[PDB]
Amino acid sequence: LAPRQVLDLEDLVFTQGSHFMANKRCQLPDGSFRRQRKGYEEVHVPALKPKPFGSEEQLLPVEKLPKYAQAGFEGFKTLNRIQSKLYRAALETDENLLLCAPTGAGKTNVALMCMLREIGKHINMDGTINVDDFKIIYIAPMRSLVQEMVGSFGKRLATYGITVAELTGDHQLCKEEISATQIIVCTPEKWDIITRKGGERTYTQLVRLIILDEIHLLHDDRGPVLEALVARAIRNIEMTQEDVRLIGLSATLPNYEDVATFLRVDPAKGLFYFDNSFRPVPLEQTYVGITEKKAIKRFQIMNEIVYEKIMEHAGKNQVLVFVHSRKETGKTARAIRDMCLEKDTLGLFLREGSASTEVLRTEAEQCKNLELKDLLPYGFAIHHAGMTRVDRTLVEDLFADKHIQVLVSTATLAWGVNLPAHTVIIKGTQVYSPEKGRWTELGALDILQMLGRAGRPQYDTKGEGILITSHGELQYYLSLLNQQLPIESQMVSKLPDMLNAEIVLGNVQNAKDAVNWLGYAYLYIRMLRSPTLYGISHDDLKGDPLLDQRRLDLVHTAALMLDKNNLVKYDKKTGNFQVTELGRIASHYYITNDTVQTYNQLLKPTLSEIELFRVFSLSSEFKNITVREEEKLELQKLLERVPIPVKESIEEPSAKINVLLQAFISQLKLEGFALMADMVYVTQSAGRLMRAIFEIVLNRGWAQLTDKTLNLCKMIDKRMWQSMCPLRQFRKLPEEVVKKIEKKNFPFERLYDLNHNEIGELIRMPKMGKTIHKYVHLFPKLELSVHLQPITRSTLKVELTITPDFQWDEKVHGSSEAFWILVEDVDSEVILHHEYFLLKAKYAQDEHLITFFVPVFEPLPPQYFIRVVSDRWLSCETQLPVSFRHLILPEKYPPPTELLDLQPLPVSALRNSAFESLYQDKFPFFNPIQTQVFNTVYNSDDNVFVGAPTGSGKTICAEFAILRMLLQSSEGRCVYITPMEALAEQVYMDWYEKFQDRLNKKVVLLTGETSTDLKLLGKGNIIISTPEKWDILSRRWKQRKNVQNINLFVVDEVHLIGGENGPVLEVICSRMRYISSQIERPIRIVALSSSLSNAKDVAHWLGCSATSTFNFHPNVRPVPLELHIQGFNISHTQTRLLSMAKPVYHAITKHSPKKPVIVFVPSRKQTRLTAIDILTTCAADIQRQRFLHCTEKDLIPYLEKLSDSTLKETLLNGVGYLHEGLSPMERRLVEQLFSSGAIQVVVASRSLCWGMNVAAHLVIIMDTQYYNGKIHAYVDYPIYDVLQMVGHANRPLQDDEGRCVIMCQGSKKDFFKKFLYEPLPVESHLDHCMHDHFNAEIVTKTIENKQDAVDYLTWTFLYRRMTQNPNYYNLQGISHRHLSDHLSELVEQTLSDLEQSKCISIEDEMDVAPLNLGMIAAYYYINYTTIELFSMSLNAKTKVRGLIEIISNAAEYENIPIRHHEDNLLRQLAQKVPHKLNNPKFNDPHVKTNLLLQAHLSRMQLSAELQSDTEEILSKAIRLIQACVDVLSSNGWLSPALAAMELAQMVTQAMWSKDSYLKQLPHFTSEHIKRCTDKGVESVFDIMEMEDEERNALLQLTDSQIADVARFCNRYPNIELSYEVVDKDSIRSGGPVVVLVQLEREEEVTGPVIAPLFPQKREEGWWVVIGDAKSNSLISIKRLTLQQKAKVKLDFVAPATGAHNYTLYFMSDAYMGCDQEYK
Amino acid sequence: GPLGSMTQTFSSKTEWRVRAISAANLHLRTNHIYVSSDDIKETGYTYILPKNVLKKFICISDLRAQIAGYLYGVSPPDNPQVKEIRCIVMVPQWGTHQTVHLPGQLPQHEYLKEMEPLGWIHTQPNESPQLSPQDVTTHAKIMADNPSWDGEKTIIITCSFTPGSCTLTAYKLTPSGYEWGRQNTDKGNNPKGYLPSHYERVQMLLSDRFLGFFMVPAQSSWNYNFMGVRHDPNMKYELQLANPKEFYHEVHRPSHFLNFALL
């Protein structure tokens, strides 16, 4: 709304805070009266009578509670009054509640009931609590209250197994305390700062219940924190439509009905108000208001008043006296007792002869404290926060035992200990407020609590509370304590800061969001009901009835303030708010907005300590601090001595603040009372203010100031300067020895090279030489070393190895130690790279490898530095100079192949009508790259390399070579490899069409199953495979003729040799080269690639001559690419994504307003959030549905097919999204809508970037990192993924260009410019992945000695690159002897590992041979470490379920980065499965399948994306099982092998051994099983032997469903068996036992296995196993594939003459129930 | 005459605080570095000082107490008459406004073994038309004790604090200057025998086209001006490859941080 006004917020503030009194009059209970005395007035208010148990409100017995909740009232008989009235609302409903009652009336027990209701929601059927399904937040105003609540709640709920805890001020390591806690107890501010920070799968989604205790803090200057929490919670709730219950606990004060509106309490269901007659003990009140103004006379008046009241209670009642300074406790108790002595009244307290005297006298002798000494024997005591714990417990136990007579204390007692007293006196209501910089009145919460301690719940018949204050405050305290001080909103002051926090979170993105947010504030409710109180005329209100305009004005004002201070960029015309990094820091560090403006203005890279202290001292948190005349001499004394000079005078506050901080760090004692409290305030703030400064200068890269400010953070925390002995940080080390060490100036570092003796001698104290030596080596210390790996001449990869070099001890290191790794330039001025490093206790002895990139230039600079500095320990750092004097840089890369300007090639150039029919409907001409390479591809047999950007049509280039192959050889075999299975599937579709359909050849896609893949290879002309599927096949090329007789080998996306799965691709390409050299009929190779800077090395490795090497660079893409890389300078991920949301929309409207757009986002969740946010933005553009290009009615039939409603809404507005969690049908529907132009925008998760069948005009890549849950860290997108994403901006048949915007963190921008605008350098990583391949080559006898292994390596890409970029591979030169030494070293390492693993043997240290274990690993394509683990764990009596556990723990299984919240679901799966599993550990990627296998097996559940997960796991399971079989079979054991075979069956059919076979049949269930048991049939054959009518009747099934049953029954194995023992008589002891077994199928079936729950299509496998179960002995075994009839031999030795009866087993790997036994 | 009417109390206002405040502003001068070119004829060697280490040298210095670094370098591959200064070495030292006190031991480190010593650089508070007699004496005594310091190749660069700037000037000794300086025992400002012909100006250029580096002591820092008692002409030291701390850094004045701790 247009005519906004700018308001003065300061003129709307209630300056008195909680002392503001909105009521004009105070009415007093009947029988009150006012007495006059010299210089003061007394007001007396009598005790109230309890309401006399009207309404027959009986006390509810714990019996009639719900049984789950009775345990929470163990040891109670009934409820008390208030809980009985609150029971139904609290325990039997989820209504939000507000309870008003006098403090001490029971409100906390009602909160207990709400907690019990919540806990009840999470009962298992075993009675336990799923403690991981929920969090409860209990917000309490005071820290001492937090602690007491953690204790009492924890004891009440321990029977439930529930953990209650508080949160530490340290959260960057201790956020596991949130994960461990079900009931979090904290202050408003703590929960505010925690929820201000938006993270990744944080636990705020578990919050179901929030209790706001003492919610009348709303009236305090702290109250706005509660408003922020409630507005944030309610808006989050509506955002996510998950309910969260809110409970408010309040004193009884006016406006409670407005508090209930604020909490969304229904006044008829959840509002309960109990007046002060419900106090547990009636209260006679005395108020004493002094009229004297002269301080001197006023203080003695007060002391005479307290003495007279004391005297009224001496010897009849204990008195608790509350004062407001720890020192005042002693001074006041002393004034009173001195007056008693001088007046001779001390005998009234301490009677002579009474037993209480006798009890006191003991510690009246002992006396631990000094003031306690002077006062304890007289009957007086003090209590406060400078005293010990056991002194305080002394005071508490003594007072509670009715021994102390006069206890002087402070508010902390009132909040933190449950110690009441008959008489309470509040001695003055003035308290010194450092933050206000002056004396003010005590807060109301404090007053209420202290007077709530008057009267003890069972001893006293009444309490007597006496409040002494100044006369002008009488009406305030009278109002507060008699239900009449109204609760108001203090929010107007804090509005800019609160608004920024919501902008930073993304909850408020424009002024209308902000008006909506303000509508949930307590302020808004109060503005509506009392407008004039808040600066609004009654006629202003009538002209603006929902205060829309006034809220707009307040929001506008605050936003302008935030914009002036650079926290926010505020667009006045649109109302939009743009987050900034400085705004984020202000919110996340809880800093006021003026302060971060000061910091932004004054922080410079050149600042020294002097100016850094000055900057801190100008923070606005300190703006009320003044320099008082009386403080000026002492301050001057400190100034002239401070170690950091102060430039300004002691007239200015900032100099006092500076000096106070420095005095704190030096641990100086000050004398002035004001100076000490001011120091406390300043230094309590300093930690988080200085960490904010640290984060600012670190992220700007300011090396020296980053160092100075991290040091200052640590000096504030440790309370010492750098110069002090770092050993002071071990609190246990006695100060004297440390001072002795310091006196000697020698370096602490010297201590490392000494021992017990020399250490004792150097400081000349031998008695300590040992423990010093201990502490020296507990001091955190890290050794560093680097491997420099040049990428180009201007980019260097660094692998940093961190080695811990100290002894860990949980007593000083906790469970982790954090460090900053800072990579700094030549001058130590710029931080080129940095990152956080966490050393966990469990890895404390392990080396850690970190890898990062830095820029370099020529001429090379002298050196960089790597500093690793502790985040917490002072003088704990290691710096490694990284010299470049010996860095070997790779050769500058060559120019690209020139793109010749040729006549576009018509399709007719194929000179073949059948061939031409594949393209002539698609286009008339081939593109420039196809035209350039065509002659070489199509008219020569030369090996070809084509390097070009994704989207350049390289696939057609390979088709040219295939068509040449088809003209040379009628049964030519082309094998085609691509690295990604999704690509393989797409190529399969397209080429099945081109070459099978219109050309009548055979196209096949390898599946991964050996024998069927061999059949595909034999009959296919085009064979499509991913790399591992061709690796396992081509390993056996010496015995597979179809592998050698390959005409054409095409490898696509060959630049991925440099990425994560590159080694296997390198290996198979190298093998194809080696074969082609061994068979003298060369295999033509064609390699396709993204543009490569070192293309010539790939070409040369693959045998491509330089005229056949086409090495094009990115600017040749046939559809020109307009690439824009846009940097975002925000280091926190969720906030950075927020800052990207609007630019996404603006990029669409600028670069592609009408043409299709793909937005890639980092996560599944973000796809939906960004689709919604785009829609929101185009609605606020008054351009809703601009992305919808078909009509809604044409879209509805589509929309019905989906299960996601949100997806339906967004799709209705022209925006789709794609993420892993969508059913394949849904994904296809969205892709169809996108490609048919019906919807214009699709948002896709990054993980789909390889398997999308859509393309766009514009691709937006929104951020370039994703969260890895395995390692709990953000990972950069591989450059390969980014190139593949950019490639989707390519529509040759439709666009004149493609456009792409990459939005990335600013510190990534340079990297992308280097590796997207230029061709890509790739390296090998085969040297990190050698063992399985060496092992395979030893099995097939390609490697028979160490020389063979070196020769083998010479065929690799690794070998070529070693001469081109030696330092990358850790060579230090390229000489042939360097090469030979390096290769020999690598060979010796690999073969030694394989030998230790028992995969191979090594004889005469030269010759290698395969061991049967190596042969198994190679045959089944299993990692050698996996098979070693198998060889270990397996034995002759491992249980089946143990097998499941073994197999789950195998290198093969590392696939889960999503779910930790299903760890509890698996915990309960452990009970559902009969697996008596051992070691109930949890949460591993391998520990999923430990029982997620069984989740598949029982058919237990189909669930979520885990479905996809299961499909990969099952993929590897059979092989792993078969390996175990093989292991057992070789050992000689008969039983566990058969167990493994039946487990193969189990996995295939998804059943178990004890379960019923009938579970195999389609459309079956348990009821059918018990019916077939009732008839007496238990076999598949049984079902086959039935009459068709009776068959159809027994099953109660549909016709088509029994047709499914019939197809299964007609492929079920029914094999006739026969055996013959060759020469059964003529069998001599020692000779051969040739047993023969002939098997004949009954109908030679030709389908694969019927196994719907198993993913891959399987062929049927069999084992003919002759053994004797007499002793777990297997004697002969053969695997077989049976087609129709098979004849199988088995050989065996006959040791000695004797009993000769053997058992022949026929075991399937696929079906359960066909396992035979003959003799 | 007021014994009692007017009493006043002295309050320490110590010297080094003001100088620390001043030293914090030194970075401003690194934008205004001038080299005097009043020499002529271009005959001797030409010295090229990389700006990065010179700026750092200025930033770690003091307005009133001189500091010194040792110069190490080489000639470009094909110009033997050009000396490129590649490294400055900071060693334990203290200074006055008129001279610096260095150990007798020269830098020894393997990492320097491929360079030649080129002399030394020092700051001084004010420009001067002449090379001071203290500099001549210091250079001549170094050469007398270290034959690796060639009189035709080792220079003194002076870094003078001019208005808002620094002015650099480079000199070398002559034979007669060596002979007078090596026997000169008069540390004052006007010792007998001192002559303008005991030195001559040499050509120096600043460069941004390469970068120098620093070496500093391995276990101490270089600045002993706050603990001269711990400094000794005969002290020995090893070196490390790292950048020097500024003059008033806490590690240079630890007694200020332990003594304040006594109130």
Ligand SMILES: CONS(=O)(=O)c1ccccc1
């Ligand atoms: C303060 O808001 N943050 S929260 O308490 O964790 C919350 C999460 C979800 C719904 C409601 C509240």
